[PDB]
């Protein structure tokens, strides 16, 4: 007559049947939600570090290669 | 609920500074006979048969959200501002 109301039965057991999954993204939390201004300053730093690195890498490769 | 009829506030157009706006009550335009949907509604209605286009015969609400039309007194441009659903609204009354 009435349809069922509460029941949460078997669901825990079904969850344990396929195991209770956990996240695995791990390293390098990312993109838009990163701190305004500070991360842009980091981008500029990284770009600076990259420019110094690129200058070293280009010179070192070019001198040896030819 | 009661508002005064002027407000000094940010204009979102041209002037960046806070400046005066007049405050008034929007109340919905009278419908055009030239609107494309109204043309379609006319076309569907014409000839034999009934109709579906906007009607409701079982209305729930006794109230309307009030939206104020704010007119910048500097640059002569308008902006809408929406606020709570009321039964009772008052303009310029004070206490």
């Amino acid at each position: 007559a009435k349809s069922k109301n509460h029941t949460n039965h078997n669901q825990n057991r079904k969850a344990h049947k396929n195991g209770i999954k956990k996240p695995k993204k791990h390293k390098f939390m990312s993109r838009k939600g990163l701190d305004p201004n500070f991360f842009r300053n980091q981008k500029y730093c990284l770009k600076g570090i990259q420019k110094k690195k690129k200058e070293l890498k280009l010179k070192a490769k070019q001198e040896k290669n030819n | 609920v009661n508002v005064p009829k002027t407000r000094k506030t940010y204009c979102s157009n041209k002037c960046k500074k806070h400046t005066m706006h007049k405050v008034s009550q929007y109340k919905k335009g009278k419908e055009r006979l030239s609107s494309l949907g109204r043309r379609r509604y006319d076309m569907k209605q014409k000839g034999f048969g009934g109709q579906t286009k906007p009607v409701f015969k079982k209305k729930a609400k006794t109230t309307k959200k009030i939206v104020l039309k704010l007119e910048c007194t500097k640059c002569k441009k308008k902006r809408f501002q929406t606020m709570k659903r009321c039964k009772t609204f008052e303009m310029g009354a004070d206490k």
């Binding site: 669901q11 079904k14 969850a15 396929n18 209770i20 999954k21 956990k22 996240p23 993204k25 939390m29 939600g33 990163l34 701190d35 | -």
Partner: protein
């Protein structure tokens, strides 16, 4: 179901005994930021950045900090899966977690043990104790220090 935000007020949100408006200076100043683990505890004073019910007493990593806000990565079980959720909370709500402090003290103590062993060029283990089974022992017992027990009659 019929579930608004703060439901279970008389349960969790109820203040600690005589704890009103606690806001002293030392509360703010901890600073370990982006790597740190942090507990999320309710404050009786502060309503402004109060968490949802589930996050009370839970712990997770800080991933973002602002002027007096903290983003905290907290684990939540959602039916068949535990998933990481980005909980925005306030400075009053975050409490520095102590699990890190246990690891650090053990690292420091073990490091001192390692350093001592290294100076001597010793071969020894800095690994934690198991609290193993008790070995043999001895006590000398006069007739005066030993007591005879028996069950008790009803009285």
């Amino acid at each position: 179901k019929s579930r608004g935000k703060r439901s279970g007020t008389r349960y969790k949100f109820s203040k600690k005994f005589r704890k009103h408006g606690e806001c002293t200076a030392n509360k703010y100043l901890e600073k370990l930021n982006y790597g740190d683990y942090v507990d999320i505890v309710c404050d009786s004073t502060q309503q402004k950045g109060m968490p949802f019910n589930y996050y009370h007493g839970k712990t997770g990593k800080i991933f973002h900090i602002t002027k007096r806000g903290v983003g905290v990565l907290v684990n939540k079980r959602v039916k068949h899966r535990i998933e990481q959720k980005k909980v925005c909370v306030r400075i009053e709500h975050v409490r520095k977690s102590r699990c890190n402090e246990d690891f650090l003290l053990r690292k420091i103590k073990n490091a001192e043990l390692i350093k001592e062993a290294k100076l001597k060029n010793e071969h020894i283990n800095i690994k934690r104790k198991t609290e193993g089974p008790k070995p043999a022992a001895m006590i000398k017992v006069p007739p005066s220090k030993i007591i005879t027990i028996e069950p008790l009659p009803f009285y």
